[PDB]
Amino acid sequence: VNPTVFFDIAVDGEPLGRVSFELFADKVPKTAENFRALSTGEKGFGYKGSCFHRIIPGFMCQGGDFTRHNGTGGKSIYGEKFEDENFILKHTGPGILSMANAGPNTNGSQFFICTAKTEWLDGKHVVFGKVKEGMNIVEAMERFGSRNGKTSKKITIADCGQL
Amino acid sequence: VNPTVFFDIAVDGEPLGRVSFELFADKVPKTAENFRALSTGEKGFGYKGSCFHRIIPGFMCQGGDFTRHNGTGGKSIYGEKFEDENFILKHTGPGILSMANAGPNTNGSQFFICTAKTEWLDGKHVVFGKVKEGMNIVEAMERFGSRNGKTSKKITIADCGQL
Amino acid sequence: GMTEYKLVVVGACGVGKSALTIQLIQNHFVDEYDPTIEDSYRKQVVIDGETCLLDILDTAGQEEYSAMRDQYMRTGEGFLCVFAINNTKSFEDIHHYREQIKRVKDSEDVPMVLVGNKCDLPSRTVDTKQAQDLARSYGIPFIETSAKTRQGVDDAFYTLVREIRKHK
Amino acid sequence: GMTEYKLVVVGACGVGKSALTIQLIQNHFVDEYDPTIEDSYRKQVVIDGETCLLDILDTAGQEEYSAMRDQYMRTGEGFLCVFAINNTKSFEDIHHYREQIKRVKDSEDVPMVLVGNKCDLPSRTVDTKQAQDLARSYGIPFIETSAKTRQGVDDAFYTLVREIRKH
Numbered sequence: 265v266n267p268t269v270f271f272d273i274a275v276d277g278e279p280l281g282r283v284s285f286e287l288f289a290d291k292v293p294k295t296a297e298n299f300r301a302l303s304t305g306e307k308g309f310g311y312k313g314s315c316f317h318r319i320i321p322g323f324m325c326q327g328g329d330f331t332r333h334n335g336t337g338g339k340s341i342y343g344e345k346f347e348d349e350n351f352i353l354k355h356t357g358p359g360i361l362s363m364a365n366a367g368p369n370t371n372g373s374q375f376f377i378c379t380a381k382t383e384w385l386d387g388k389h390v391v392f393g394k395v396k397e398g399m400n401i402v403e404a405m406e407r408f409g410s411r412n413g414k415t416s417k418k419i420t421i422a423d424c425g426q427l
Numbered sequence: 428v429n430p431t432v433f434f435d436i437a438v439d440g441e442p443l444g445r446v447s448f449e450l451f452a453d454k455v456p457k458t459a460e461n462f463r464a465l466s467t468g469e470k471g472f473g474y475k476g477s478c479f480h481r482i483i484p485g486f487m488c489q490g491g492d493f494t495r496h497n498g499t500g501g502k503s504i505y506g507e508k509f510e511d512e513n514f515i516l517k518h519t520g521p522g523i524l525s526m527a528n529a530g531p532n533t534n535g536s537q538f539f540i541c542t543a544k545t546e547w548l549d550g551k552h553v554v555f556g557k558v559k560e561g562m563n564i565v566e567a568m569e570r571f572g573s574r575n576g577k578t579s580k581k582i583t584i585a586d587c588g589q590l
Numbered sequence: 591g592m593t594e595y596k597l598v599v600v601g602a603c604g605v606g607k608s609a610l611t612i613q614l615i616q617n618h619f620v621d622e623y624d625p626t627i628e629d630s631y632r633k634q635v636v637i638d639g640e641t642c643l644l645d646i647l648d649t650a651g652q653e654e655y656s657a658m659r660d661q662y663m664r665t666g667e668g669f670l671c672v673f674a675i676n677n678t679k680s681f682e683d684i685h686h687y688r689e690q691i692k693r694v695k696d697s698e699d700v701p702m703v704l705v706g707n708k709c710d711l712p713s714r715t716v717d718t719k720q721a722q723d724l725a726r727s728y729g730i731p732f733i734e735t736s737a738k739t740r741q742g743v744d745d746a747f748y749t750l751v752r753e754i755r756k757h758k
Numbered sequence: 759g760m761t762e763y764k765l766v767v768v769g770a771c772g773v774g775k776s777a778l779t780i781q782l783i784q785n786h787f788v789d790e791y792d793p794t795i796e797d798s799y800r801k802q803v804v805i806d807g808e809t810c811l812l813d814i815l816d817t818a819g820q821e822e823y824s825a826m827r828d829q830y831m832r833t834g835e836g837f838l839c840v841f842a843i844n845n846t847k848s849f850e851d852i853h854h855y856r857e858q859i860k861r862v863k864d865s866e867d868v869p870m871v872l873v874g875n876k877c878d879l880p881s882r883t884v885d886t887k888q889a890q891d892l893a894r895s896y897g898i899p900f901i902e903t904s905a906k907t908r909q910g911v912d913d914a915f916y917t918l919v920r921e922i923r924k925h
């Protein structure tokens with residue numbers, strides 16, 4: 265069964281709203297479990313307290329660097345990096361949750377949420393989830409993005425866990 | 428004899444260096460006294476702890492908003508704003524210390540230090556001082572500026588006073 | 591992908607160009623005066639059932655820099671020409687901005703919308719029919735707005751996008 | 759007033775475009791990989807006794823977005839075409855870059871400089887003669903750099919400014 269996780273988003277420390285995701289453990293159980301475990305922090309580390317370092321209106325919101333907090337770090341529950349599980353799922357529209365990477369088989373903890381169709385990323389980033397509730401909060405996060413993704417306010421995951 | 432004041436500049440909390448200014452009390456006694464008193468903090472408020480919010484390479488470094496810390500505020504020792512004392516002195520080159528404003532007779536506490544000749548500001552901004560020592564500190568501050576002035580690091584007046 | 595529209599907000603200093611833009615982008619009213627050097631923003635919207643990406647340039651109205659408006663006028667696709675309804679001088683500056691945009695673009699047919707901002711203020715000096723006449727004589731739409739109450743904010747930017755689509 | 763020069767740093771991914779730019783602008787080294795979407799920098803310098811303002815566009819080398827380089831080539835005055843000494847594909851990619859700028863600006867005489875970064879690397883795959891050969895056909899220089907030690911960083915950017923002044 266597909267688990268459900270949530271982010272409680274804050275803007276400059278002020279609460280913004282909750283986004284929940286369904287994680288497609290039925291198609292990508294390894295990628296889904298990494299995100300699930302990092303959302304609960306049950307391994308001793310995870311997404312709580314980290315920020316969305318890149319928000320580009322019309323495209324996606326990227327975050328997940330909880331080791332360096334500069335957009336270059338992050339790690340998975342399996343080690344520093346793990347392999348691309350498969351590319352069954354595609355970037356079909358807004359709300360898609362997918363793994364950021366720096367080349368083939370360099371998945372860690374960085375992820376992105378699409379705010380539009382990004383089909384040129386298909387076959388290159390592993391899709392593993394979709395926003396279930398709170399797409400308006402993701403849309404609200406775009407108010408603080410920019411052309412190259414620099415955010416004008418600090419957008420953080422104040423809390424997160426499993427539903 | 429003209430008074431001398433210093434700024435101790437820090438970059439993201441790390442010390443950068445000391446800049447000292449001569450204030451032309453002989454030519455603009457009211458404007459110089461405002462800047463002098465705000466540097467010592469003797470009125471109970473002033474420049475210590477405030478940041479440089481606008482740095483544009485090739486032109487100037489601007490700071491002095493100690494009331495709102497967002498580029499819109501600041502106040503003088505005579506009230507929120509005071510009048511243009513005179514325009515005798517010109518923006519002749521790097522190191523010139525001059526008053527920011529939002530139109531005629533709106534001098535508060537915001538100031539700017541030229542890193543080049545800005546002659547088109549003559550007659551519009553009151554020049555009241557020049558860098559005495561530490562021009563290379565000001566030049567080092569430029570590396571954290573941008574085209575529209577937004578800074579890539581927090582440039583603060585970590586300490587300041589009268590020599 | 592979705593179409594990207596290059597919008598440029600122009601007008602005299604202090605008329606509310608930045609306030610209008612930040613209301614569009616962040617749904618928040620800046621009541622303080624933070625004079626713009628130059629700023630760019632992005633927002634995806636749905637106009638007439640089609641999603642598109644607004645790229646908005648917030649410009650500087652200072653008259654000392656009027657000979658430097660050339661580059662942004664060449665790349666901009668549509669222009670929001672803003673005056674304040676309590677500032678007769680800003681309404682008179684509109685003519686100079688339009689003439690510039692025509693001269694820079696070498697065309698009489700440039701997508702433009704005339705915007706009378708600060709319509710929440712109790713004492714106007716420019717009358718609504720006066721701006722309507724000038725808009726008619728230009729062949730462009732006119733919209734009264736308030737960045738404080740958000741009146742006509744979405745309308746002004748959306749009407750500019752519609753003007754650009756017809757220009758195609 | 760001082761003259762402004764619009765330089766564009768191009769090349770494939772990871773060759774060191776941002777590491778070179780940050781060394782020029784910030785005088786420190788970025789050991790971590792922070793891939794660029796697009797960044798712009800400003801810096802005033804004295805080159806051959808003249809104070810001038812450098813406007814530097816740091817670009818992304820991802821091949822998926824190779825069709826979108828036309829806009830920044832239409833605005834740029836000079837181009838720092840960077841390959842890596844250990845990346846043969848980056849060497850082959852310079853031809854498509856030059857042909858792009860030739861077609862975008864409609865000219866065959868556009869100021870350019872070939873930069874071979876990672877000179878400090880204990881490997882190689884591209885020889886210096888083939889670099890100077892292509893450079894002699896275009897009429898451009900070649901400089902070997904290392905952002906870790908800042909070797910040749912200032913030389914690379916300043917040579918391109920000198921090339922723009924001739925045009």
Ligand SMILES: CCn1c(-c2cc(N3CCN(C4CC4)CC3)cnc2[C@H](C)OC)c2c3cc(ccc31)-c1csc(n1)C[C@H](NC(=O)[C@H]1[C@@H]3COC[C@@H]31)C(=O)N1CCC[C@H](N1)C(=O)OCC(C)(C)C2
Pocket residue numbers: 318320323324326335336337363364365366374375376382384385389411412413591791792793794795796818820823826
């Ligand atoms: C040319 C400009 N330009 C665009 C783009 C493109 C378009 N379209 C393209 C598609 N056309 C369709 C056929 C019509 C129309 C025109 C329009 N406007 C733009 C922008 C706004 O112009 C400034 C992009 C884009 C992307 C990159 C570089 C430049 C880019 C880039 C660099 S690295 C990477 N991408 C993968 C990256 N890796 C890491 O972060 C590593 C760090 C270290 O180790 C762990 C960690 C990663 O996984 N993601 C997670 C996924 C989305 C991705 N980032 C990202 O942000 O892309 C943004 C964007 C805007 C979607 C694409």
Ligand SMILES: CCn1c(-c2cc(N3CCN(C4CC4)CC3)cnc2[C@H](C)OC)c2c3cc(ccc31)-c1csc(n1)C[C@H](NC(=O)[C@H]1[C@@H]3COC[C@@H]31)C(=O)N1CCC[C@H](N1)C(=O)OCC(C)(C)C2
Pocket residue numbers: 481483486487489498499500526527528529537538539545547548552574575576623624625626627628650652655658759
């Ligand atoms: C057209 C672009 N453009 C330029 C400019 C110009 C040029 N040159 C002009 C001169 N030519 C030579 C003879 C040929 C060559 C081309 C090149 N490139 C640029 C820039 C980088 O393009 C993005 C500028 C500039 C300035 C403004 C708006 C736009 C500007 C602007 C807005 S408000 C103001 N200016 C006064 C402001 N007031 C407040 O901040 C208010 C806040 C609230 O109430 C208290 C407080 C103030 O007092 N200062 C203290 C003093 C310097 C001043 N800020 C400032 O920052 O100017 C910056 C800059 C770059 C020097 C000028």
Ligand SMILES: Nc1nc2c(ncn2[C@@H]2O[C@H](COP(=O)(O)OP(=O)(O)O)[C@@H](O)[C@H]2O)c(=O)[nH]1
Pocket residue numbers: 601602603604605606607608609610620621622623624625626651707708709710711735736737738739
């Ligand atoms: N009452 C009111 N004030 C406004 C409105 N728009 C802007 N202002 C104020 O007018 C001042 C100037 O606004 P600004 O957007 O910075 O002017 P700009 O130079 O055109 O960008 C600010 O203090 C704003 O708060 C408005 O619609 N109503």
Ligand SMILES: Nc1nc2c(ncn2[C@@H]2O[C@H](COP(=O)(O)OP(=O)(O)O)[C@@H](O)[C@H]2O)c(=O)[nH]1
Pocket residue numbers: 769770771772773774775776777778788789790791792793794819875876877878879903904905906
């Ligand atoms: N050994 C070495 N590595 C470098 C050098 N320059 C860049 N790198 C590495 O190359 C990687 C990518 O650098 P980057 O600036 O992002 O290249 P870009 O994608 O073209 O902008 C970084 O990890 C850098 O540390 C260099 O001169 N020597």
Ligand SMILES: [Mg+2]
Pocket residue numbers: 607608609624625626648649
């Ligand atoms: Mg403004």
Ligand SMILES: [Mg+2]
Pocket residue numbers: 775776777792793794816817818
């Ligand atoms: Mg880069």
